[PDB]
Ligand binder design. Structure first.
Ligand code: TA1
Ligand code: TA1
Ligand code: GTP
Ligand code: GDP
Ligand code: GDP
Ligand code: MG
Lengths: 426, 430, 120, 426
């Protein structure tokens, strides 16, 4: 029943996916050993969406862990929930990609794509009614951006009709940790736009901005950014794992949220968000959730929505609430801020409400937005690419892998084409 | 005798069914288990077996299981025939395209199979009461596929249409007008009398009259159920002037294509408010024509009345009905078309309204059901047509409809048809 | 020929509406026309048929004012081939001085236009 | 049968009307919950005049409570008889008028006039044979004087033939509690003279004079002034709610009491009035009632009748008495004091007698007088207006509401015109 098959690519992808697995195992009440320990039967009916039923009433997640290094596999298996995973889905090479997209897409990951495909196919045939694939990866470096796009293309080729949603942490200028990120991002979005039905753009800088300027953490580590990602990870698929008054699965979002086929790079967000010493004072009412939700500080990318127009926004609310105030805020936001939403398309909001709130939360709101302002990251990536493209650096480490100049040129042309379409409707 | 098969399509249809049957079991005194503790007043809606069990003649069809298998878990799990409540595997994705060609295609044949096995025990089948929503993918596509085959297999039988219609301001999906426009061919060609339901107008109703600040859709349902039961009141209980379901629709309909009347219910009033009013027949008669009581956000004072039907129930004397309608025709603010100086059809029933124990509606000795066609309702479509233009002008979301097997020009036939309907409801007003 | 509008045209228009027999009591025009129901009464004198007065209700809440004016835009103004934006309509409904008069000026001219037209 | 529809405007109006409702509920024997508890059937036949028959033999008064603040509604509903009123006739705004006539007549009360009209119309259609509207309000401040005149004008416009009687407490120099009263009074009487068929002028100072110099109360509170008002409130309509030998309803008074259409601001009064320790000694005979009745101390305005001439006086007596002494006092008063009554109109008195006296009283007398001396309050209001008109104070708080100078000028001109007519026949 609407089974969803997860794939992890790169160290970023597999660690954030592992923490997502931890979060939704707590939501479904799954013991670290894999046994069920939840309180209500509501955690139990839609276990088949993320986990496989096995002997002893223990449940194994439908995740395929893919990497080119064994060290990340070693860390994840030794992590808090390493034991719950399938030993077979730990499919990995030995030599790393070295943050080389060409390595992952032609040499290093091409040999392991056969060993990942035979696992993803068995996972899919284990499903009763497959709905799609949620894939976690990073546009930075050559592992997540490199092999991730290749296997995404393969699964899209053999699964042409299933939903393809990807959550992509993507490079940024001021919190860049690797020199050669823009090549990787340009060569990755080239395949992401053509193949993926859904892509969530996540930028690390805005995660940092959330954890300082909203969460007031003095030392928010990398796991806290993983937590911020996993919150929306769990939120976007809430409707098809739990009952709610307005059920909106992934394709419910899709039919409402992407006006033209290529305009599918979106803006995630989550509410509520407070510091430790300020949650005691906050009124968690739904209107306040809304005023927090469309704030430019709550978002997870540097693209400020005030520099563009929203095409479609998705607000999947959660908890035991009525909904007239839901409609009134969703119309007030787009009425008083009608200059920030495309007036030519009147009702830019998709509303979904779930009946069971997250554990420890009385209510929650998950933000998904289509704004023309998201081109801020794309054109900046293209500009940084040009600053390292126009007269030939670092290309020997790609062309040595069989990579060629004209494909780089087409990738840049496609970035320019994308930013053109997203500026067209602004 | 006098059986009616109720169809429930989409989440809205199945849940409004859950509320309607909740009302019916109480008013006819059936337990949630189907038994009768202790007249054939139930033969209109419920079938009887040898063991003394009341089995409803209803189908719950949803292309997704969540709401219906929730019904399989609720208090009415044993009331219904389990495999007359049909569930699909893939949701409709708020898309008319898949619901009309792709996903409903494999399930409709079982739906008509169950409709046939519901028809073959009905000795006096009167008509069909199908419930859905315009904006929903299932309520659009599957209903569009279903009335097509019902109109050729049960062409003589009347098909009443109770549909939930989008608000001018309140909306839950961006694709709702797309689903709504391709429904218009079904109501025009494969429906006999359609009843349109607006959520925002009835939101205002419950805000002002019921004094309740925080109702749910369940409160909406526990009044749509009253409106449908009041329409079916004459078929199930005794009355001085019982209106047949065919008599009803003959009184509503001036022309085969003009069959889209508004609905209002009176007295919609809270329990704390029922005490301080005597609640005469006149004031419930006067309250119905008040634009602040309309079920659809359109001003009747902006339009002209063609047919008026007074469906009273409870302790109402027809003399008081005549006295009230004399006052109604006395004021000029309510101007009827030059078609109907006779104006009013009167229907009286002896059963007082049945109150839901968990409801927000008061217990009143008298209740009136107002159903009227008017030219003012074209405004409820006069914003939807301009709305549909505002999306179709770029081909806003058509690649999904195109990708699921719909012809691109079906949108062109759709807005041509709504324009024809809008014109048809304007010439008759002269 | 005056290219622009002078202060005297306002007075001319002020006197003309009084010249028509209108079923209204003694009160200023700039606050009554704002309601909207007065405008259709003005036009009743010319063509009683097109005016229904079974469609707009006199109130004095801005919500009903704008709801009536919007209706009037698409049922009287459209016949006169006359179109106005909502930004203007807001101001008319606010009893804004000068704003509704900017529509009162051409309204009568359009009415006389319809008079001259040989309608069968 | 001669139903009479009551409207309350302002805090003064609604509280004095509420205490009037209490008084006549005791007279008609109506329980606080609304049920009937009277002793004789005489309290029962004319219940339809003031109350609506409902289920359970309980009776709801035909009153419309209008205000611009919810606090007064809160006090009245929590008062002694708050529960008997209709929840629907509590029609009220949130922001107050701030004692601004322009606010109530143009901005604050204009939005609520629609919500009061739909209630007064339903109350009128609920009546079998409507006779008129008795409206209680205050000329002070901007609520009672402001919206009261507007809705009075509206009901006069749509009910042109029904009796319009208003009881108006009006400002005074020495017991003034608000700075901006004279503006309000001048802008209110402008509409009162043109629209109202009847206006009873009530001045607070003479109520104080009654409660000290006649009632000998050491601490007569505001409710005691309300009681003094409500006594004549009940007295003026006695004849059409109870049998009597001389029946004189409101229009019976009108045809006898206002010689020219605009001379309709009148002088209320009531007898008997004693202190607690002096009622034991008083002989309550009708002649003594008369000698008390035309006393300048018994009246409820500062206008001393010895400074003018009575045009018409109405003496609605009540109780089981014969009437030859009634005629003899009513002729002796106008004969021995013929210099205080217009000799040019010979019989200035209208006599009415009721058969059932007030509860606890063997007899009672209600005074209504038309004296040219009532111009004392009008010309003094005009003079105080001029002291704050001639060179422009406080006008920014009116002109900010769309109010204009020339309308103030016409209001003052109309006050001068009125005082001219009332001095003309003196
Ligand atoms: C005592 C109290 O009220 O504290 C709350 C809490 O509400 C706060 C402090 C929580 C707290 O979260 C954090 O401190 C945090 C730190 C870094 C990154 C993200 C969160 C909380 O830890 C988080 C936790 O939230 C949940 O349990 C949700 O179900 C959440 N799951 C997790 O956060 C989680 C934590 C550890 C392991 C597995 C899951 C979730 C959210 C969306 C979708 C699915 C699950 C709650 C209620 C609290 C604490 C404990 C302090 C917040 O978390 C969430 C996700 O709601 C941070 O801002 C929100 C709201 C509050 O301020
Ligand atoms: C023991 C005794 O004889 O005392 C009498 C009484 O006659 C006195 C003291 C009463 C008394 O009134 C007052 O004390 C009073 C105080 C402030 C303002 C007005 C009155 C009495 O309270 C008032 C009351 O009058 C009534 O009941 C009338 O029906 C009156 N209704 C009310 O006063 C009333 C009181 C509470 C609640 C509801 C109504 C009425 C008058 C005209 C029209 C309709 C009704 C009576 C006889 C008395 C007492 C009890 C002391 C007086 O009242 C009236 C209105 O007649 C004050 O002067 C008169 C005459 C007397 O002096
Ligand atoms: N009045 C009322 N309307 C409802 C209710 N439930 C759903 N709706 C309407 O249904 C519309 C959207 O349709 P959906 O919620 O998707 O239900 P559906 O018909 O099954 O469509 P799909 O989910 O795509 O299969 C909303 O715009 C609502 O107006 C209800 O309980 N009361
Ligand atoms: N938000 C987030 N970003 C990370 C995390 N870990 C690393 N990053 C950054 O994301 C980028 C992704 O590149 P990387 O995954 O190392 O390339 P790969 O090895 O080829 O997959 C790196 O440059 C890191 O700076 C994390 O846990 N959260
Ligand atoms: N006789 C009498 N006068 C009052 C009473 N309450 C207030 N007043 C006075 O009457 C005046 C009326 O003004 P007010 O009603 O407050 O203005 P509004 O709020 O605009 O209606 C006030 O200035 C008070 O001083 C009362 O109970 N009886
Ligand atoms: Mg559905």
């Amino acid at each position: 029943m609407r089974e969803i098959v997860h794939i992890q690519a790169g160290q970023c992808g597999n660690q954030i996916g592992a923490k997502f697995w931890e979060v939704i195992s707590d939501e479904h009440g799954i013991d670290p050993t894999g046994s069920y320990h939840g309180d209500s039967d509501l955690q139990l009916e839609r276990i088949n969406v993320y986990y496989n039923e096995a002997t002893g009433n223990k449940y194994v997640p439908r995740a395929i862990l893919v990497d080119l290094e064994p060290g990340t596999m070693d860390s994840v298996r030794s992590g808090p929930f390493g034991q719950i995973f399938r030993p077979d889905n730990f499919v990995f090479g030995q030599s790393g990609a070295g943050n080389n997209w060409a390595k992952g897409h032609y040499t290093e990951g091409a040999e392991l794509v056969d060993s990942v495909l035979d696992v993803v196919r068995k996972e899919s045939e284990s499903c009763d009614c497959l709905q799609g694939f949620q894939l976690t990866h990073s546009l930075g470096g050559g592992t997540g951006s490199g092999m991730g796009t290749l296997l995404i293309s393969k699964i899209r080729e053999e699964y042409p009709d299933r939903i393809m949603n990807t959550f992509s942490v993507m490079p940024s200028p001021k919190v860049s940790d690797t020199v050669v990120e823009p090549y990787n991002a340009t060569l990755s979005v080239h395949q992401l736009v053509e193949n993926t039905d859904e892509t969530y753009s996540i930028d690390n800088e805005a995660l940092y901005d959330i954890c300082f300027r909203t969460l007031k953490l003095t030392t928010p580590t990398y796991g806290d950014l993983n937590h911020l990602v996993s919150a929306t990870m769990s939120g976007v698929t809430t409707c098809l794992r739990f009952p709610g008054q307005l059920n909106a699965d992934l394709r419910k979002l899709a039919v409402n949220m992407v006006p033209f086929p290529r305009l599918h790079f979106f803006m995630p967000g989550f509410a509520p968000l407070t510091s430790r010493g300020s949650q005691q004072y906050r009124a968690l009412t739904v209107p306040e959730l809304t005023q927090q939700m469309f704030d430019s500080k709550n978002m997870m990318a540097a693209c400020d929505p005030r520099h563009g127009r929203y095409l479609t926004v998705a607000a999947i609310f959660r908890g035991r609430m009525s909904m007239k105030e839901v409609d009134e805020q969703m119309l007030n936001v787009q009425n008083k801020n009608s200059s920030y939403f495309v007036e030519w398309i009147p009702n830019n909001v998709k509303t979904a409400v779930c009946d069971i709130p997250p554990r420890g939360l009385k209510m929650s709101a998950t933000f998904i937005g289509n704004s023309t302002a998201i081109q801020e990251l794309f054109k900046r990536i293209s500009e940084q690419f040009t600053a390292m493209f126009r007269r030939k650096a670092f290309l020997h480490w790609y062309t040595g892998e069989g990579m060629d100049e004209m494909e780089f040129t087409e990738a840049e042309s496609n970035m320019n084409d994308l930013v053109s379409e997203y500026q067209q409707y602004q | 005798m006098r059986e009616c098969i109720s169809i429930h399509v989409g989440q809205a249809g199945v849940q409004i069914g859950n509320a309607c049957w909740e009302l019916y079991c109480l008013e006819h005194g059936i337990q949630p288990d189907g038994q009768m503790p202790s007249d054939d007043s139930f033969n209109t809606f419920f079938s009887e077996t040898g063991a003394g069990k009341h089995v409803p003649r209803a189908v719950f069809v949803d292309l997704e299981p969540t709401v219906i298998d929730e019904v399989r878990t609720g208090t009415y799990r044993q009331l219904f025939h389990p495999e007359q409540l049909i569930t699909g595997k893939e949701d409709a994705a708020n898309n008319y395209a898949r619901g009309h060609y792709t996903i409903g295609k494999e399930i409709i044949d079982l739906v008509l199979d169950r409709i046939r096995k519901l028809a073959d025990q009905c000795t006096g089948l009167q008509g069909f009461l199908v419930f859905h929503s315009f904006g929903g993918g299932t309520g659009s596509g599957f209903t569009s596929l279903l009335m097509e085959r019902l109109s050729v297999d049960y062409g003589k039988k009347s098909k009443l249409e109770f549909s939930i219609y989008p608000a001018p301001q309140v909306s839950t999906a961006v694709v709702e007008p797309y689903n709504s426009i391709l429904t218009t061919h079904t109501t025009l060609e494969h429906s006999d009398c359609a009843f349109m339901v607006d959520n925002e107008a009835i939101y205002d109703i419950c805000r002002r009259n019921l004094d309740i600040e925080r109702p749910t859709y369940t409160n909406l349902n526990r009044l749509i159920s009253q409106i449908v039961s009041s329409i079916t009141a004459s078929l199930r209980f005794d009355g001085a002037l019982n209106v047949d379901l065919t008599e009803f629709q003959t009184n509503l309909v001036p022309y085969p294509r003009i069959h889209f009347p508004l609905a209002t219910y009176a007295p919609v009033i809270s329990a704390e408010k029922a005490y301080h009013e005597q609640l005469s027949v006149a004031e419930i008669t006067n309250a119905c024509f008040e634009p602040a009581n309309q079920m659809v956000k359109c001003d009747p004072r902006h339009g002209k009345y063609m047919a008026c039907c007074l469906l009273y129930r409870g302790d109402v004397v027809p003399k008081d009905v005549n006295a009230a309608i004399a006052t109604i025709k006395t004021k000029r603010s309510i101007q009827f078309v030059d078609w109907c100086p006779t104006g009013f059809k009167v229907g009286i029933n002896y059963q007082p309204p049945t109150v839901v124990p968990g409801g927000d509606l008061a217990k009143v000795q008298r209740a009136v059901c107002m159903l009227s066609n008017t030219t003012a309702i074209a405004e409820a479509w006069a914003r939807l047509d301009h709305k549909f233009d505002l999306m179709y002008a770029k081909r806003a979301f058509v690649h999904w409809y195109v990708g699921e097997g719909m012809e691109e020009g079906e949108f062109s036939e759709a807005r041509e048809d709504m324009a024809a309907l809008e014109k048809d409801y304007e010439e008759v007003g002269v | 020929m005056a290219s622009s509008v002078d202060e005297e045209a306002l007075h001319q228009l002020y006197l003309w509406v009084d010249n028509i027999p209108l079923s209204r009591p003694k009160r200023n025009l700039s606050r009554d026309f704002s309601d909207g129901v007065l405008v259709a009464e003005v036009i009743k004198f010319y063509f009683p048929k097109m005016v229904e007065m079974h469609n707009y209700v006199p109130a004095n809440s801005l919500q009903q004012k704008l709801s009536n004016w919007g209706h009037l835009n698409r049922k009287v103004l459209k016949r006169l081939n006359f179109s106005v934006p909502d930004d203007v309509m807001r101001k008319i409904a606010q009893c804004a001085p000068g704003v509704v008069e900017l529509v009162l000026i051409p309204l009568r001219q359009r009415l006389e236009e319809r008079q001259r037209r040989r309608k069968q």
